[PDB]
Design a protein around this ligand. Structure first.
Ligand SMILES: [Cu+2]
Length: 180
């Protein structure tokens, strides 16, 4: 159980903007599509997953991990609240509510030119970081090297719980960033 707190993931950006009465236009939209999962940002979860996330999560459902109460997270928008980034090293931090033995934390990113016009697909993601396995960590920090980009981008971090040492389960976090 956990989520990316820094840069704030999309479920955290919108949580903090107000789940019941959001004011930001993307989160207002997310409310209408399914956002009551925003109370439990640590749970964008899939049970049984063993490094085969695309079997369990359909394209267009990467941000909700296909959970309906987060379907608002699946909307294509160029106005998601985003953190300013630049190419090079950026810390990404997972705040874990319940620690687990870890096969890996991985990060992916959209390609240069990405236009936010369709929901996020597996084919949209390039691997940009792999943290390797870990023991339990209350806080998991990955210094991800951001490739050259301009414009707004989506980062997808994925937490694979170590199924050999522990249990099979996946946690999924879409983060919005802006390369300027
Ligand atoms: Cu957990």
């Amino acid at each position: 159980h956990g989520y990316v707190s820094s840069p704030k993931s999309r479920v955290i950006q919108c949580k903090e903007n107000g789940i019941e009465n959001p004011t930001h236009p993307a989160c207002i939209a997310a409310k209408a599509a399914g956002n009551g999962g925003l109370y439990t940002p640590q749970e964008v979860a899939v049970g049984g997953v063993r490094d085969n996330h695309d079997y369990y999560i359909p394209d267009g459902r990467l941000c909700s991990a296909n959970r309906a109460n987060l379907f608002g997270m699946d909307l294509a928008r160029n106005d998601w609240p985003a953190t300013s980034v630049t190419p090079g090293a950026r810390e990404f931090v997972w705040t874990n509510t319940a620690a687990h033995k870890t096969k890996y934390f991985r990060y992916y990113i959209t390609p240069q030119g990405y236009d936010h016009s369709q929901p996020l697909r597996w084919s949209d993601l390039q691997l940009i970081h792999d943290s390797g396995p870990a023991d339990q960590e209350w806080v998991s920090t990955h210094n991800v090297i951001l490739p050259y980009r301009t414009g707004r981008h989506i980062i997808y971090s994925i937490w694979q719980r170590d199924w050999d040492r522990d249990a099979a389960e996946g946690f999924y976090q879409c983060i919005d960033v802006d390369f300027g």
